[PDB]
């Protein structure tokens, strides 16, 4: 929050990115959600 950079909006890409390849391997239910 201190600096004005989209560092937060990033974790979303990483989070949404992770699950895509992390949850597509197993069953729709994954400990990454």
Curated annotation (Swiss-Prot):
<feature type="domain" description="FATC">
    <location>
        <begin position="1"/>
        <end position="33"/>
    </location>
</feature>
<comment type="subunit">
    <text>The target of rapamycin complex 1 (TORC1) is composed of at least KOG1, LST8, TCO89 and either TOR1 (TORC1-A) or TOR2 (TORC1-B). Interacts with PIB2; following activation of PIB2 by glutamine or cysteine. TORC1 binds to and is inhibited by FKBP-rapamycin.</text>
</comment>
<comment type="function">
    <text>Phosphatidylinositol 3-kinase homolog, component of TORC1, which regulates multiple cellular processes to control cell growth in response to environmental signals. Nutrient limitation and environmental stress signals cause inactivation of TORC1. Active TORC1 positively controls ribosome biogenesis via control of rRNA, ribosomal protein and tRNA gene expression, and rRNA processing.</text>
</comment>
<comment type="similarity">
    <text>Belongs to the PI3/PI4-kinase family.</text>
</comment>
<protein>
    <recommendedName>
        <fullName>Serine/threonine-protein kinase TOR1</fullName>
    </recommendedName>
</protein>
């Amino acid at each position: 929050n201190e600096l004005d950079v989209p560092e937060q909006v990033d974790k979303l890409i990483q989070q949404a990115t992770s699950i895509e390849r992390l949850c597509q391997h197993y069953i729709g239910w994954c400990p990454f959600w």
